[PDB]
């Protein structure tokens, strides 16, 4: 009965590790199912109202997109959004940033990162009037150095769109918005 209790405890522990491991491959599947290797990210954010309130309450200040790539063995990148805004746009804007991540093939890639980047929030209404902003990475910003940690400092647009505009336009629909990032891949190994 002490031996029976010990093996029951040993199985319960292994069952918990499996439950963690299973949950963690669920996330891995969702990352793989939304990967993109042509330098264009489409990011779907569901539950706007709830997640916006989470950012206002300070529960969750920012959200990260899934990674996307310039090629099958190129730069790894993602997007960062602050629904309640960051910096000079806190409380009044939605802020949107580009993030260089540590890639497995960094030792083969040009540094600093010098590719043109366009940040967009999509119009879901018939006009297709997408808000957009392109920029040429400043070769001296630490945001574009060869990554040393998992993520470089994000860089982008603190005052990308005012919240009043966003919420009065056709950008939200079924409590969902869409963010698009386009990195230009024309001047690189193909």
């Amino acid at each position: 009965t002490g031996l029976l209790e010990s093996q029951l405890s040993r199985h319960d522990q292994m069952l918990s590790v499996h439950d963690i491991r299973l949950a963690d491959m669920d996330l891995r599947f969702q990352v793989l199912e939304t990967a993109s290797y042509n330098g264009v990210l489409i990011w779907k954010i569901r539950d706007y109202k709830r997640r916006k309130q989470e950012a206002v309450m300070g529960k969750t200040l920012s959200l990260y997109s899934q990674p996307f790539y310039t090629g099958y063995f190129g730069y790894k990148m993602c997007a960062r959004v602050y629904l309640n805004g960051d910096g000079m746009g806190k409380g009044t804007h939605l802020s949107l940033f580009f993030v260089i991540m540590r890639g497995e093939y960094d030792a083969l890639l040009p540094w600093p990162f010098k590719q043109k980047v366009t940040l967009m929030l999509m119009d879901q209404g018939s006009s297709r009037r997408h808000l957009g902003d392109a920029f040429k990475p400043d070769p001296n910003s630490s945001s574009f150095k060869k990554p040393t940690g998992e993520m470089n400092i994000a860089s982008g647009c603190p005052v990308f769109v005012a919240q009043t505009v966003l919420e009065n336009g056709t950008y939200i629909k079924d409590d969902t918005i869409f963010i698009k990032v386009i990195v230009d891949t024309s001047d690189l190994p193909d």
Binding site: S62, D86, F97, I153, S155
Partner: peptide
């Protein structure tokens, strides 16, 4: 291009 806080 500003950085995040």
């Amino acid at each position: 291009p500003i950085q995040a806080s």
